[PDB]
Write a protein that binds this ligand. Sequence first.
Ligand SMILES: Nc1ncnc2c1ncn2[C@@H]1O[C@H](COP(=O)(O)OP(=O)(O)OP(=O)(O)O)[C@@H](O)[C@H]1O
Ligand SMILES: Nc1ncnc2c1ncn2[C@@H]1O[C@H](COP(=O)(O)OP(=O)(O)OP(=O)(O)O)[C@@H](O)[C@H]1O
Lengths: 256, 256, 95, 95, 263, 263
Amino acid sequence: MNTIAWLGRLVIERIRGIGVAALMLLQIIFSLPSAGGFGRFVYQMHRVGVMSLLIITVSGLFIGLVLGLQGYSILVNVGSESMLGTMVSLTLLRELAPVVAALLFAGRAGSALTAEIGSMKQSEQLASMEMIGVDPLKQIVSPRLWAGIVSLPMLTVIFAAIGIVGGKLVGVDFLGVDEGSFWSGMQNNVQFGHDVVNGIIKSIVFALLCTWIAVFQGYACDPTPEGIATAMTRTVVYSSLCVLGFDFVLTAVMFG
Amino acid sequence: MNTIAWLGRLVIERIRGIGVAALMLLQIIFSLPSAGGFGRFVYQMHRVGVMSLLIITVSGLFIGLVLGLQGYSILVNVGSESMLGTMVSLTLLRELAPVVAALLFAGRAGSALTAEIGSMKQSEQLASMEMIGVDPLKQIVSPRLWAGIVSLPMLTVIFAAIGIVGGKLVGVDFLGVDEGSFWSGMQNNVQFGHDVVNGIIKSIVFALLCTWIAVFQGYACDPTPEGIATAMTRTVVYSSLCVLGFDFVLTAVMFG
Amino acid sequence: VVQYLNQELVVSGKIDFENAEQQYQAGLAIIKKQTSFPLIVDLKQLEHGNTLALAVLVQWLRQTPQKSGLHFKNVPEKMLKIIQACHLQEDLHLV
Amino acid sequence: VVQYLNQELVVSGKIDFENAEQQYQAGLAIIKKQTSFPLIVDLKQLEHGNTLALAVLVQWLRQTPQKSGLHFKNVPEKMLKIIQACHLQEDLHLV
Amino acid sequence: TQSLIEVKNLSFNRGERVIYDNISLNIRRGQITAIMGPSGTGKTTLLRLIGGQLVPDQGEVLLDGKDIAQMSRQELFAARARMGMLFQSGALFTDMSVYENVAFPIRAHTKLSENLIAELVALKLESVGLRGTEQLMPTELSGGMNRRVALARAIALDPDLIMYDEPFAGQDPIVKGVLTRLIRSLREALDLTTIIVSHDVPETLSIADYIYVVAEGKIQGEGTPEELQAYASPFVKQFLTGSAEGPVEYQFSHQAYLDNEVR
Amino acid sequence: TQSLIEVKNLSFNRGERVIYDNISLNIRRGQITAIMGPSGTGKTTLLRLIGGQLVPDQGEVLLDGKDIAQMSRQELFAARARMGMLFQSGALFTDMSVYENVAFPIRAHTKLSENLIAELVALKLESVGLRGTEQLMPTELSGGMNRRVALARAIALDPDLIMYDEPFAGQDPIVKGVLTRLIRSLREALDLTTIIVSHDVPETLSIADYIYVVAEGKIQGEGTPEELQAYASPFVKQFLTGSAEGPVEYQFSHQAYLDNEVR
Ligand SMILES: Nc1ncnc2c1ncn2[C@@H]1O[C@H](COP(=O)(O)OP(=O)(O)OP(=O)(O)O)[C@@H](O)[C@H]1O
Ligand SMILES: Nc1ncnc2c1ncn2[C@@H]1O[C@H](COP(=O)(O)OP(=O)(O)OP(=O)(O)O)[C@@H](O)[C@H]1O
């Protein structure tokens, strides 16, 4: 009965690991900012956001070419493909662009923060910063958290806009559907406040979880060159489970 | 004109980097196996495959609950939801289960191999193994490559089976559609050799790219405790671009 | 804390991290009313010279014409120990 | 390579990594035809004893009565240097 | 000579593990105090308990009457202006330049203009001997210049307590020869009070003036390096010489041998 | 005494960078040969060029007539049975046990039964002094026992060339004292030929018999440790003493201190 004793010991440490990461979040956001805190947030928007711009724009095109090619092969048997422009822009705006653009943000810019704060912990830069008197949560961690909550909802819109334009390329200009019935099928069925705004609120709840996890794993490492790399797979797995987990809860509320 | 000169120097090293990874693949697969090579492949199927079983089975359920809840909200306006069991099992079998189950394999078991072969390179276990005479490509790398090509197509089937069963739960037993017209809508429209086999061949081309990249990045590191962690984000990004890139090429051939 | 001129500016009190911004500039205005560089310093009332007191002292020499419009005298047995540590006594007329 | 018997088994030739599997077992059958343990070894034709020759030698002592039936004699100036390195000459009757 | 830091009977437990059961230290002013011992014990956690980052559990840290933990957040921020720390690997801030590293303790505590900060950094980087490098990042910095910059950062406020933590751990005899003079020189010209944690018996007997040797949670011996070798306890005598006789053993297990059967 | 390895005028370039422009070494049989120098140069790449893993570009590596690179794949696999290598960090195989570490060079080369391999590992782990540990993984192994296991793995075939690579880099004086006896003992009882790459002048002058000092691509000095200090070149004299005068400098740049304006 050791394996059941080891298994129960595993999920007790993972439960108290949540409670440390909850108390770490209440110390960051319940504080008025220190002098100079906006100059570092603009710089941390460059590392997290702007470097992630190339992967999202390219991969957003490749889903749009697939959604236009799969939606045409199904809607041609029933002979109604004036709804092609609807189902492409309805799959992206409420479902795929909130979800897939959080599965690529957890990889590229999610795990990179855990390496960045993690390598500062093994090389004692975090411990050296505290003896000077500077608190490392306000100095290092907090400009990285606020640059994650802002930079992902700005990236699902670029994912959704490039995905529709890419879906317009293979649907209208390669397979040969009508251009005017493509766009006029959108404005009838796709509202703004029910679909585009509910695709943004779905990504703010996703941007909080892919950043609060990816910061806590790099702050509570164990300082070891092979203990860092084991916490970069702990933050890609835990982000992809909370994205798909809060997907169903937010879909049932918004579209139920 | 330095930034243009630095940008051209970046993509020349990334082109040469492909040619090293191509010559590394021709040395692994063009060799008859050494004595004892099957005993390590069964063990490496445990690390790559069996440890990845929990994330895929849980996340496969959460997509099925979403596909049943979104497909019902659209198909109830046109009043034809005897096609609910078709479009759920047609979205998974040819499109989502080959693609999403490769975006979670690149994170969990893809990047873990790059940490595993990467930490053997900085701590000189690979250099020490060669002076004994044992070739580290045949000894260490090659049981990890063949355990990646096998373990992913066994995992998209478990992803697709749990996704349909989960979609049957929220469609039939919670929203209240007919159970008999759910299943009989499947056997009419979903063939085996055109849909289930073409969803498996799509994942063998995906399992080759998410493993040959994730092995080469951990073999050609630069030995440095913060040079390993920069090559674990190089292998999640490059896998997610080749999954979505070879998606459109394989979809256009199979369903064009 | 305070410094006087008379004919020879003498620095008195302590120079440490919350009096070094007015004490640097009160001496800076003194230099431009005094031509043909007789402004030799007889700093001797210092008691806790701690390398910031050297930092404001070199910065007075930076504005001075040429690069030595002054001379320092009667060092408080400890400021010159700082000077050899920074290898600066080829650059300050300490004699 | 070869070892005889007569009345005292003598090990001759070289013992290194491609003759140590038959040479261990050819001596192992010798022990069970010889009772009341007079099987004292006079190994002296060895020329390149390289710690594997000690490894087959202790393994003959393992499958013997009690734990000691063989006594070793006339060591080739080098095998005993191996023995003190492994601190084994409280365990081998080298005298 | 008066004591600056008086550690008095503390205990630190990182989870059913004893580090420093009961121990009392004295850090005399103006005097180089070394702390030696076997690797794995809490040597560099003792510098963090002196510096006041980790918390004691059954004792006090005495900085001239005042406890460290009883200080307010505006006195502890003032007491940390009187301390320096050169870490094990030279913990520089890699995301910012050399001039920003040295000016980081000045801009965090004191409020000065740029024409005085850029002079003070040019005097701190001069006293180490690295005046020409003020613009490059701490990569393309050699390993011998990495620790010398981090010495200038820890000294950039003129404290009275600078704690080196293995300043020569696997370095060239040239770079070891440069650093052993700067510990002598900068202490003597600035009235510092150094603490050297190290395990290197030749220099540590010839650079220190009072040596503590901690082994498993208590002191094995103390005193000036004359009487440390004259009052040689059976653990200190093996430590300073590297002998094969004493309380720490060579062999793993003493089960004869023939008592194991390799099956 | 005859030479075992004769390095004769090679060059190694890792991409417009010169390591070992022109250099000739002699490794005499049965004799401890040390290689010292400043950190950053190709010291541990010289052991890989001797051992035949990296390739030379303009020279040869002579192992008793035969070049290393001209060997076939069935002679180079046979020549590597005559070489050992103890690396910088004790490169153990963490995914397998201690008994599997020591038996790894035996099972890769020779074909023996289990009752002889498990005896040979019990004799190799005894000669180091770790006979009771044969079943645990190389974590829960202390740092002092980590390098001692990796010495038993490199010696488990009785070679005639074992190349230590900084065997005491930041270790306790006890663990340094154990390892400096095993280099003396195991060499003398097995007729080895050791190579110690290190930078620690006290032991390396008193454990070696022929010292090469390489600085930027050539030899700065060689010979027995009597005449190394008697024929002291101006770079070797600064290296062995750690002085402040010679061809390697203290200051970074020389501009007085007024030719810079801190703007
Ligand atoms: N983050 C941590 N979590 C749990 N235990 C730790 C942690 N850091 C250190 N320890 C343990 O506490 C002990 C403290 O010893 P420490 O390594 O700090 O001193 P040291 O070996 O002298 O360090 P250094 O050699 O860097 O000066 C070690 O045995 C270590 O195993
Ligand atoms: N994988 C690599 N790619 C490019 N350059 C390298 C690589 N490995 C080492 N180098 C460079 O080649 C030189 C070889 O020196 P190396 O570090 O091997 O010797 P060393 O400093 O004595 O090592 P050690 O201290 O571990 O014995 C170093 O200056 C290093 O910068």
